[PDB]
Structure formats: C-alpha cells, structure tokens
Design an enzyme around this catalytic site. Structure first.
Site, PDB file in Angstrom:
ATOM      1  N   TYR A  83       3.711  -4.325  12.018  1.00 41.15           N
ATOM      2  CA  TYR A  83       3.455  -2.870  11.914  1.00 41.15           C
ATOM      3  C   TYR A  83       4.650  -2.101  12.425  1.00 41.15           C
ATOM      4  CZ  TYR A  83      -0.626  -3.859   8.684  1.00 41.15           C
ATOM      5  OH  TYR A  83      -1.416  -4.197   8.163  1.00 41.15           O
ATOM      6  N   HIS A  97       0.891  -1.213  -0.037  1.00 42.69           N
ATOM      7  CA  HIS A  97       0.050   0.088   0.049  1.00 42.69           C
ATOM      8  C   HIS A  97       0.863   1.391  -0.002  1.00 42.69           C
ATOM      9  CE1 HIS A  97      -3.878  -1.917   0.567  1.00 42.69           C
ATOM     10  NE2 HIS A  97      -3.203  -2.794   1.182  1.00 42.69           N
TER      11      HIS A  97
HETATM   12  C1  HEM Z   1       0.200 -11.559   7.933  1.00 41.20           C
HETATM   13  C2  HEM Z   1      -0.715 -10.505   7.438  1.00 41.20           C
HETATM   14  C3  HEM Z   1      -0.400  -9.150   7.151  1.00 41.20           C
HETATM   15  C4  HEM Z   1       0.826  -8.731   7.466  1.00 41.20           C
HETATM   16  C5  HEM Z   1       2.328  -9.274   7.863  1.00 41.20           C
HETATM   17  C6  HEM Z   1       0.954  -7.100   6.692  1.00 41.20           C
HETATM   18  C7  HEM Z   1       1.906  -6.398   6.601  1.00 41.20           C
HETATM   19  C8  HEM Z   1       1.556  -5.177   6.644  1.00 41.20           C
HETATM   20  C9  HEM Z   1       2.892  -3.988   6.678  1.00 41.20           C
HETATM   21  C10 HEM Z   1       4.355  -4.447   6.869  1.00 41.20           C
HETATM   22  C11 HEM Z   1       2.227  -2.904   6.204  1.00 41.20           C
HETATM   23  C12 HEM Z   1       3.124  -1.366   6.212  1.00 41.20           C
HETATM   24  C13 HEM Z   1       2.696  -0.343   7.250  1.00 41.20           C
HETATM   25  C14 HEM Z   1       3.699   0.571   7.340  1.00 41.20           C
HETATM   26  O1  HEM Z   1       5.015   0.578   7.137  1.00 41.20           O
HETATM   27  O2  HEM Z   1       3.377   1.394   8.165  1.00 41.20           O
HETATM   28  C15 HEM Z   1       0.856  -3.000   5.881  1.00 41.20           C
HETATM   29  C16 HEM Z   1      -0.072  -1.948   5.365  1.00 41.20           C
HETATM   30  C17 HEM Z   1      -1.260  -2.033   5.310  1.00 41.20           C
HETATM   31  N1  HEM Z   1      -1.939  -3.302   5.464  1.00 41.20           N
HETATM   32 FE1  HEM Z   1      -1.249  -5.232   6.286  1.00 41.20          FE
HETATM   33  N2  HEM Z   1      -0.453  -7.003   6.246  1.00 41.20           N
HETATM   34  C18 HEM Z   1      -1.130  -8.102   6.521  1.00 41.20           C
HETATM   35  C19 HEM Z   1      -2.315  -8.378   6.247  1.00 41.20           C
HETATM   36  C20 HEM Z   1      -3.385  -7.247   6.045  1.00 41.20           C
HETATM   37  C21 HEM Z   1      -4.805  -7.327   6.297  1.00 41.20           C
HETATM   38  C22 HEM Z   1      -5.659  -8.592   6.835  1.00 41.20           C
HETATM   39  C23 HEM Z   1      -5.363  -6.352   6.122  1.00 41.20           C
HETATM   40  C24 HEM Z   1      -6.744  -5.628   6.324  1.00 41.20           C
HETATM   41  C25 HEM Z   1      -7.642  -6.185   6.807  1.00 41.20           C
HETATM   42  C26 HEM Z   1      -4.158  -5.263   5.728  1.00 41.20           C
HETATM   43  C27 HEM Z   1      -4.130  -3.945   5.368  1.00 41.20           C
HETATM   44  C28 HEM Z   1      -3.304  -3.183   5.092  1.00 41.20           C
HETATM   45  C29 HEM Z   1      -3.379  -1.780   4.788  1.00 41.20           C
HETATM   46  C30 HEM Z   1      -4.585  -1.051   4.639  1.00 41.20           C
HETATM   47  C31 HEM Z   1      -2.179  -1.147   4.921  1.00 41.20           C
HETATM   48  C32 HEM Z   1      -2.035   0.683   4.661  1.00 41.20           C
HETATM   49  C33 HEM Z   1      -1.754   1.044   5.808  1.00 41.20           C
HETATM   50  C34 HEM Z   1      -0.900   2.556   5.726  1.00 41.20           C
HETATM   51  O3  HEM Z   1      -1.667   3.127   4.881  1.00 41.20           O
HETATM   52  O4  HEM Z   1      -0.235   2.987   6.572  1.00 41.20           O
HETATM   53  N3  HEM Z   1      -3.156  -6.132   5.376  1.00 41.20           N
HETATM   54  N4  HEM Z   1       0.784  -4.344   5.899  1.00 41.20           N
END
Ligand code: HEM
Ligand code: HEM
Lengths: 404, 404
Positions: free
Chosen positions: A298, A22
């Site tokens: 996160y 994202h």
């Molecule tokens: C094991 C499962 C998951 C992992 C390890 C993961 C990991 C991550 C990481 C590392 C980021 C970067 C955030 C940052 O650097 O501040 C991110 C962003 C994001 N993830 Fe996950 N994710 C997973 C599953 C999911 C799920 C289930 C959802 C929604 C229900 C999701 C929705 C999002 C969204 C919307 C962002 C954007 C956050 C932002 O705008 O800062 N992801 N994810």
C-alpha cells in the site's frame, strides 16, 4: 499571454492516476463510541473506557472496474475506516465478504488482470475469469459465494465489513491472542445509485450506524482447530457453515455512526491514503503471508499514485511453531481438502438457510456467465465444478448447454 | 522475497492519468486513398496523385466523463486521425458537431468544470451547465444544437468529423487560401455499445469508410462575408441555415477506410498522443485564438499525462489586416448579434428540415434538464432563452413548470 499559459498549465495537471484496485468510491465522516468492556483482552487506548469517542473518516468503494463505472454490477465492495486516536491513525481496510479469493500473495496480479477488461478490445471477458478459476481451486469458495444473491444485493449502507485477517492484541504483561473484528450493518441484511443513496440518507438527517464485534482465539488452541485461521480464503464460522466446524464466539466493542459527507471530494476522499500498516500501540500483525504483502504494497502504491511526480511477545511451544511454519512451504500454494470442503458445505447448506430459489438463482447466474466462453473452457469448467458437488455441476451444465 | 517485491512493484505502477477531456475512447487502423485532383489549391505531398495511399490510425472518444463511463449519454464525440506520410505525422483532431461551445480560449477550464461531476458529491449537476450557459451567450448555438436528437444519435461509425477551424494551404509561389475540411460518414446519418459495435463491424470484414471534402475561401473575400470565419463557435454554411448567408461550396479529396483493430489497447491506443501542432509541408495554422491555444496546450498536457514521471506567405491589403485584428480586442469576449442570430435561425428552420416532432423533442429535452435546477436559475434560463425566440422560451417554461 502569460496569464492564459498559466491558466492552461494549471488546468493540464489536474488529474492523477486512480487506485490500482477499488478506483470508484464515496466518503463520509462520523465517530466511534465504546459501549462495552474489553479491558481483559485489550490495551489499545482507543477502546479503553465506555463512552469514549473518536472521530473517523470512511471510504466505500467497488472492486474491479474504473473510476466512472457502475456500482450495481456483481462485485465485491470495500469499506476503509480511518480513526484519529491519541497515538496516531489506525486504519481498518475491510471487505463486505468474510473471505478472499486466494491465499498466496504472488497470484494477486493474475487475479486482478483476470477481473479487468479485455486487454485488446477493452470489453468484458468472462473467459479470463473462468480460466483463472479452473487453474486455481482455492478460489472456488469465493466464486460459488459471489454467484448467489450476495454478489448483487448490498449498497454502501446495507453492506457489512470484515477485516478478514488475524491480528495480535498484546497485553502489557506480554501475553496476546489472535483476533478478528468486523462491523455489522444496523440498516441492512444509473452508475451512482449507492453514492446517491448514501448522500441522500446523510442529507435527510438519518445517521447510519454499524456494530463492531471481535472474535478471540487463544494461540495454543489455534494449531488444534479444523481449519487454518491464517488462511484468508477461509472464514471463521459464526453459525452458518460448515456444520462440523465449531462456532467461534464474539463479543461487542462499540458502534460506528456516520454524520456528514465530503465538502471537496477530490481533496478529501480521492487523495485519502489507507494502509493496514497504520497501527497503534497494542496491535501487531499476524503471520499471514497476504497480510505481510499488504504491509508493503500500500505505501509503495501510494508513492506512485500520490507521489511528487503526478512490549516483547511471549514465546509459545513447539506445536505452535510447527503450525506457523506451514505458511512458508511448497505445499502452501497447492490445493488441499478444505478448498473443496468449504464450497461443498456452502452449497449443501444454501437450501436450508434461504430456500430452493436461492440455489436455483445461483445455478442460473453461473450458467449465464459460463454461456459466453468457448467449448473447451466450458468442459474444463464443468470438470472443475464436479469436484465440489456432482449435482451442482450437472445442473449448471444441463442449463448452460441450452443457452448457446 | 525479492521476487514478490519486484512483482508487486511492477504491478503497483501500471496505471497513468487519463486525458483531461475525451478520456474514454476506442481505436482502429486503416488507410487514406486520394481519388480527386486538388493540385491547383494544394501542395501537400500526401494529397498529390490520384490513387496515392497512406497508412492511418484513428481514436474515437466521448467528451465529458471519465474512462469507465457510458457512451450512449448526450455528449459530443471526437475522432482523431493520425497519418504517416513521407514528411512526418499529420494529425486531424475532429469533432462530430460543426461548431464549438466558446470563442475565447480563456473560458475553457470553466466550461470543462461545468460539464464535470459535482465537485462535492461526485454526482451529476445540470445547474453548473445552465449557469454557464446563462453567463456566456456564445454557447447558446451549441446548447440548442445539442438538445435536439443530434446529441444522442451517433455511434462511432455513423458520426461525422469536422476540424472546425481554418487552416492555410500554401502554394509554392507564396499564395494561400483559407480551408476547412471534414469527413462524411459512408454508413450513417451497457457502457460499451459504440465500442462493441465498431469492433463487431471490424470482425465481420465490413470496412467502414469516410468521404473527405474541403471548403476553400479566398483571403480577400473573407473580410466581406456575413460571418467571422475565424470564430470557431460558428459554422460554414453548406445549405441548411441560416438562409440569408450564402453557401460555401466544397470539393472532394479522397476517402478514409478502416480495417483492423488494436492488439494491445493500452499500449497502442491509450498512449497515443495527438496534437494540432503536428503538421507537414504545405499547411500552416490560421489566426484563430483557440487554435493558437491548442497549439500549446496538447504537448503540455502530454508532458504530464505521458511524462517520464508517471515558403514565406504573401502580404495582403489593409482591409484584411483590420479584419484580422478583431480577434485581439476587448470586444472579442463580448456577445454580438450573430450569437443570437444563429440559434434563432436554427430553431426557425427545424420545422422545415425534420418536422415538428423534432422541435417538440428539443423542447422536451431542454425542459427535463431545466426541471432539476433551483427556481431563480430557472427564471434566468427563461430570460436568456427569450433572447433567441419568444416562442421557444414560452414553450420550454410552460413545459418545465409542470414537472417540478
Ligand atoms: C496480496 C494481496 C493484496 C494486495 C497486494 C492488494 C493491493 C492493493 C492496492 C495496491 C490498493 C490501492 C491502495 C492505494 O493505492 O492507496 C488496494 C486497495 C484496497 N484493497 Fe487491497 N490488496 C490485496 C488484498 C486485499 C484484501 C485481503 C483486502 C480486504 C480484506 C483488500 C481490500 C482493499 C480495499 C478495501 C481497498 C480500497 C482502499 C481505499 O479505498 O483506499 N485487498 N489494495
Ligand atoms: C482552447 C480550446 C481547447 C483546449 C485547451 C483543449 C484541450 C485539450 C486537451 C488538453 C486534450 C487532451 C489531449 C492529450 O492529453 O493528449 C484534448 C483532447 C481532445 N480535444 Fe481539445 N481542447 C480545446 C478545444 C477543442 C476543439 C476546438 C476541438 C475540436 C475541433 C477539440 C477536440 C478534442 C479531441 C477530439 C480530443 C481527443 C484527442 C485524443 O483522443 O487524444 N478540443 N483537448
């Protein structure tokens, strides 16, 4: 010239790593207002009192491509809401689709890499996506969902948002329930079309709004349901499909409305840090393995991207413990009957909910994607698709073999 | 689960900052072969001996947008060549346009920011570009050049490459001359069209080739020329314009041909580090202030993007010293008559080398951009354009006022 060296050194250190997923997004500000009474299931101070108001910050985004990529591609869209309450920030990291690809957190990097550009030529690769789908049968539901019109239909204002997990809402007496809330868009069903649309709407004085609803499940009724509510790849049925699974009702909580955009995008939106671990009093996480992984991932990711380097719950019965223990077993990573039941019912119910043209468009999109992969992987794709529905696989293959 | 934590920690630290400029690019490998005799002006071991062959590595790129952006936009394209000789790596950091925007290195961050997206909405901004052009009259030549078809005409195979600076080629006896070399394309005049084109050409056994030429200027004749050869915003005339400036002849050196793409893009192409400070025996930099700034800037930028944090020359006369001292004075940053002479001559010669339709296309391209800025900035743009040619400004204004 020390002044020129200082200027160039300050310029040379401006850019920082983008988010792992994202990366491309937009932001805005608004407020949340409580409109209904939920004092019998809730003790969070933010939601207590009708007319209560709380400032907020939102970040919309796409999923799989880089910072400068397009926003009208077929993808999942995210919406992260940060609320500044009297007990601290409370974050709602949401998606625009009711479910997720996988249920085992150990498969996340493989899914992300399969959705990323070609590791050698930096070009698009449908082959990796289809190989991943054929190896992991719990992603079939999301794959069938994403190749309908829902994968190319929403912008930042017409999209909805689901937290997709289960949380615990604890009362002061020690009791609690499983909950799942979401936001329903009040105004909905070039690489910057959605961004431009949102900012123009905010400029013309029209304030977008969202409706927040919650679904509540008692802990003692969870083990006796027809689906695992701790399985993030499934969705809580609200009335569409599957027909044989009873509907889980919902209540209204409040409304979220957006007013004013960013003044400095990089400082106020890009460097924003969201995490599901940001909680307040009255809400605790559930036993979802993927939620547990996200509670760690996160802050660890933000330590690298933004780093300096550049009330005791009551005890339940034995049936609940046995039902909860399933999330830690060898069989959790293997497919079951529901992994084939959900996409099959969605496919069977598409003609009644939308019509035959929706189904035909899904078939055409699937075929256009599958036409760019080798022949053996194509045969594997047809074999995997035949496990959901014979007619779907037959039509997809009969239409794909005429486009190579 | 320590294994899951290790997997997620390794995944969380994959991405690194992109380059400050020229973030999006592609790479390939090839070789350079010497075909002509330059032993009377050169002592570099790589260029001594006909038929000598040297390994190579190239990185093409765009200029102003991010990693995932498009490549068919109006922009400048870069081509960086790394050569592995018997004395070390020798880098040729080139552009596809014979000149550059500015002449004072202290104005670089302002130009880069004026070419970057809007600081508040992250959308396109022609207003910053036109304000910068109206404030800095030495960018008029490049601005007029870039709004012709040359700004939207080349891909990675049909583009040429100019080093745009002056260097010193020292003989073993202590003498030297000012030189400027470039590469002429042998096969030339969706956000990945150029990348796909290059890789498909490399996949069918067709090896692109380039011709390398050099222009030599004696140190004692440089002060008596009609233009400053140390001014990077001007170009060494090869026979097009201006008519009243004599042509500087060229000789042939060798040929560069490309064979094989990358196997891992991120490791072999993205993490490549180029710098004009990478030199060998027989070549030294000139007194160009922008070259002196670039000799420092590139290693400093690579210290942040790739950092662990994630023969005595002979003496010349007094006339040469007086002519060289001009690059360090208060008047170096102020416009002169040549800043208006070059765009005027280019505009006057456009009807004669390509036809009237080329001129009309330039006028239309200018006006579509000027139509998106406020009225006062439009008036300033017309006033600035009238300094180059009255007819050009009149036509641009008459065409722009009908589109707002
Ligand atoms: C094991 C499962 C998951 C992992 C390890 C993961 C990991 C991550 C990481 C590392 C980021 C970067 C955030 C940052 O650097 O501040 C991110 C962003 C994001 N993830 Fe996950 N994710 C997973 C599953 C999911 C799920 C289930 C959802 C929604 C229900 C999701 C929705 C999002 C969204 C919307 C962002 C954007 C956050 C932002 O705008 O800062 N992801 N994810
Ligand atoms: C004061 C003037 C300039 C400054 C400070 C400057 C600075 C930079 C920096 C910091 C980079 C990033 C390189 C890296 O991080 O490894 C870069 C890349 C590049 N610049 Fe310059 N630049 C200047 C003018 C020019 C000129 C005159 C040219 C061509 C004649 C040019 C062509 C390029 C190209 C082709 C690249 C891409 C290099 C690559 O692919 O790694 N720039 N520049």
């Amino acid at each position: 010239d020390p002044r020129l060296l200082d200027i160039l050194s300050r310029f040379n250190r401006e850019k920082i790593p983008e988010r792992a997923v994202h990366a491309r997004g937009a932001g805005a500000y608004g407020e949340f207002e409580v409109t209904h009474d939920v004092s019998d299931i809730c003790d969070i101070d933010m939601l207590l009192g009708i007319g209560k108001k709380t400032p907020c910050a939102v970040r919309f985004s796409t999923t799989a491509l880089e910072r400068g990529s397009a926003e009208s591609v077929r993808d999942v869209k995210g919406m992260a809401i940060k609320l500044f309450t009297g007990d601290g920030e409370w974050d709602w990291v949401c998606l625009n689709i009711p479910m997720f690809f996988i249920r085992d957190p150990s498969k996340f990097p493989d899914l992300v890499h399969a959705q990323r550009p070609d590791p050698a030529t930096n070009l698009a690769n449908p082959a990796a996506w289809w190989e991943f789908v054929c190896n992991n049968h719990e992603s079939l539901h999301m794959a069938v969902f994403l190749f309908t019109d829902f994968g190319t239909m929403f912008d930042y204002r017409s999209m909805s948002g689901y937290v997709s997990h289960a949380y615990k809402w604890v009362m002061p007496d020690g009791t609690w329930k499983y909950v799942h809330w979401f936001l329903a868009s009040d105004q909905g069903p070039d690489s910057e079309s959605a961004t431009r649309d949102l900012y123009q709407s905010l400029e013309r004085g029209e304030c977008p709004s969202w409706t927040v609803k919650v679904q509540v499940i008692d802990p003692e009724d969870a083990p006796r349901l027809a689906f695992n509510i701790l399985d993030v790849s499934k969705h809580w049925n609200l009335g569409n499909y599957p027909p044989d699974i009873p509907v889980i009702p919902e209540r209204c909580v409040g409304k979220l409305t957006l007013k004013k955009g960013p003044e400095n995008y990089f400082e106020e939106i890009e460097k924003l840090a969201f995490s599901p671990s940001h909680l307040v009093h009255g809400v605790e996480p559930s036993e979802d393995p993927m939620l547990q992984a996200r509670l760690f991932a996160y802050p660890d990711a933000q330590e690298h991207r933004l780093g300096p380097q550049f009330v005791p719950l009551q005890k339940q019965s034995r049936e609940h413990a046995e039902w909860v223990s399933q999330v830690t077993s060898s069989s959790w990573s293997q497919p079951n009957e529901t992994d084939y039941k959900f996409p099959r019912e969605l496919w069977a119910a598409l003609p009644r909910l939308r019509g035959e043209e929706f189904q035909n468009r899904l078939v055409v999109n699937m075929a256009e994607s599958v036409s760019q992969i080798p022949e053996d992987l194509r045969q594997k794709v047809y074999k995997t698709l035949a496990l959901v529905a014979e007619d779907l696989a037959s039509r997809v293959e009969s239409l794909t073999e005429e486009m190579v």
